[PDB]
Structure 1
Amino acid sequence: SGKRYPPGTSLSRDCNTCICRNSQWICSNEECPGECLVTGQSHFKSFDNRYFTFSGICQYLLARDCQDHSFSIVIETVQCADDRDAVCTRSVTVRLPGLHNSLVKLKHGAGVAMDGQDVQLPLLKGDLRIQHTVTASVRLSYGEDLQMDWDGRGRLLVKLSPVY
């Protein structure tokens, strides 16, 4: 990045480490978790660190486990200003076939609704934990291989571990 390092040093990316040896950084290639991001009006990020925008207003499929069906996420999008080019998120629906084949809903507040029922935070069920983070933002945590982020004003995030 335009700055020097002595040999033998081990700088570390978020993903893994790399070590200077004979002017050549050696590096591992071991996987590391990806993030699909929603924010702004309609600005999306892929797992593979793509950016784009698609100002569609419908119940689109954000993500899904696709060889088996451990989960599935469904954004719901809405126009969000007088302008036609202003489409922000309202809510997202999550579905866990692993537990009851339940249906979680993240609400434009910090609210959540399981199966139509509003629910206090924390929500320790067996796998999934839903608690506030700053007391202004919800965080789901299914098992260890999944996270979420507040879909109140529409800044949805995920954490998918490399098992997926």
Structure 2
Amino acid sequence: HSFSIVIETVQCADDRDAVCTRSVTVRLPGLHNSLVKLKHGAGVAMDGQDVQLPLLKGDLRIQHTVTASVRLSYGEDLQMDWDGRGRLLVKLSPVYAGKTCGLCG
């Protein structure tokens, strides 16, 4: 349970089949159970408070990608890249191989 990633999905057009991620939530129990929300428009909040994005406290790091996408890291073994427009890429090191659960298997 070193990390948990959750997505908020919403209808993203008039169509019923147009559904996309609005925001992302990362819970980090090892980081004193901090909750990081990645918002629409590539903002970030930590424990509900909006943060100036270059953040490096503890094992957590958050940064502006040159794409203006939010990049998040939590040691070497977890990384994330959130575009603010419903695209989320999650990278795990082989340390998590076989250990994961959720929609990404």
Normalization by structure 2: what TM-score? 0.88
Given the superposition, is the C-alpha separation of residues 132 and 119 from structure 1 closer, same or farther in structure 2, using an over 3 Å criterion?
same
Using the alignment, how far apart are the partners of 1:74 and 1:128 within structure 2?
17
State the distance in 1 between where 2:83 and 2:36 align.
12
Aligned to 1:125: 57
Q: Which structure: greater strand fraction? A: 2
Identity of aligned residues (%): 100
How far 1:117 sits from its partner (Å)? Answer: 0.4
List structure 1 runs of 4+ shifted beyond 6 angstroms.
Answer: none
What is the aligned length? 96
Cα-to-partner distance string for 1:78-104 (whole Å, 9 max, x where unaligned): 000000010011001000000121100
Secondary structure, counterpart of 1:131 in structure 2: strand
| TM-score normalised by the chain length of structure 1 | 0.57
Deviations 1:135-155 (A, max 9, x none): 611100101111101141111
5+ long unaligned stretches in structure 2: 97-105
Q: Contact 1:132/1:139 (CA < 8 Å) preserved in 2?
A: yes
Which of these residues, 5, 8, 15, is aligned with residue 83 of structure 1?
15
C-alpha RMSD over aligned residues: 1.0
Please tell me whether Structure 1 or Structure 2 has the larger radius of gyration of its CA atoms.
1
Give the conservation status (yes or no) of the 8 Å contact 1:91–1:151: no
Q: CA deviation at 1:75?
A: 0.7
Q: In structure 2, how many angstroms separate the alpha carbons of the residues matched to 1:100 and 1:150? A: 23
Which ranges in structure 1 are unaligned for 5 or more consecutive residues?
Answer: 1-68
